[PDB]
């Protein structure tokens, strides 16, 4: 998950979450 918004981690890409914006480095 991404621990600044909780949004499933399947929608990161590019090195962001997708929804927030947040770092990759947000994702646990």
Do not use: H, K, L, P
């Not at 998950?1 to 646990?28: E, F, K, L, M």
């Amino acid at each position: 998950y991404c621990s600044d918004c909780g949004a499933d981690a399947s929608q990161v890409r590019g090195g962001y979450c997708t929804n927030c914006g947040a770092s990759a480095d947000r994702i646990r």
